[PDB]
Write a protein that binds this ligand. Structure first.
Ligand SMILES: [Zn+2]
Length: 37
């Protein structure tokens, strides 16, 4: 059968801060942790 509905939250790989969207954690990694991306 076909897949159901989905949605997820995220946590920083460097400082463990929570985020609600993939674009927001990527913006945080780019601004606060660029040498760790
Ligand atoms: Zn972080």
């Amino acid at each position: 059968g076909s897949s159901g509905s989905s949605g997820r939250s995220y946590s920083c790989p460097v400082c463990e801060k929570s985020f609600s969207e993939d674009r927001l954690i990527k913006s945080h990694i780019k601004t606060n942790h660029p040498e760790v991306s």
